[PDB]
Amino acid sequence: SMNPPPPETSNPNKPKRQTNQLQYLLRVVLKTLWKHQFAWPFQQPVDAVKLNLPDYYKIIKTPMDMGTIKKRLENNYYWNAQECIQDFNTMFTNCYIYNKPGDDIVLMAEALEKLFLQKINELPTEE
Numbered sequence: 001s002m003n004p005p006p007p008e009t010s011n012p013n014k015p016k017r018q019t020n021q022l023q024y025l026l027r028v029v030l031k032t033l034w035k036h037q038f039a040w041p042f043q044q045p046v047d048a049v050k051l052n053l054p055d056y057y058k059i060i061k062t063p064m065d066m067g068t069i070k071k072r073l074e075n076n077y078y079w080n081a082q083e084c085i086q087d088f089n090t091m092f093t094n095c096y097i098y099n100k101p102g103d104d105i106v107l108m109a110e111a112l113e114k115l116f117l118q119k120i121n122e123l124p125t126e127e
């Protein structure tokens with residue numbers, strides 16, 4: 001079995017910015033979620049080989065995880081905050097699609113998403 005390559009984190013042709021909103025997404029949002037007791041499954045791509053999930057990447061065709069998001073934020077991959085918010089949303093939705101309601105990992109993702117949304121409510125106005 002094999003894992004796919006990870007999502008892109010470097011592309012010199014993609015235009016970049018570091019807006020106050022993107023700074024907040026790293027400093028506050030990512031860093032707060034990262035330290036949560038339920039962060040660990042989401043801190044790196046799903047290793048479908050290690051976890052014996054041969055169907056994972058047959059079902060999940062837009063993989064995303066907080067390790068990738070952290071790299072994208074630290075390496076300024078984004079132009080805007082919405083791109084990053086979309087990555088978080090993709091991560092949560094993937095978990096809900098692959099797993100069943102009430103599964104432990106779904107409860108973990110839901111707790112992180114609740115926290116994420118709280119933090120997004122204080123996203124600063126773009127200066």
Ligand SMILES: Cc1sc2c(c1C)C(c1ccc(Cl)cc1)=N[C@@H](CC(=O)NCCCCNC(=O)COc1cccc3c1C(=O)N([C@H]1CCC(=O)NC1=O)C3=O)c1nnc(C)n1-2
Nearest residue numbers: 040041042045046047051053094095098099103104105108
């Ligand atoms: C590092 C990561 S990343 C990650 C995860 C981890 C550990 C986790 C995860 C999970 C829990 C927590 Cl608290 C935290 C993280 N989750 C995975 C999903 C997962 O592992 N999904 C696995 C789901 C497996 C369930 N499926 C079965 O057990 C299928 O088994 C069946 C189903 C039907 C019939 C039979 C059998 C079976 O084994 N047998 C055997 C029995 C023995 C026998 O004699 N004969 C048989 O045929 C059946 O008859 C996941 N999804 N998103 C993320 C993120 N993750």
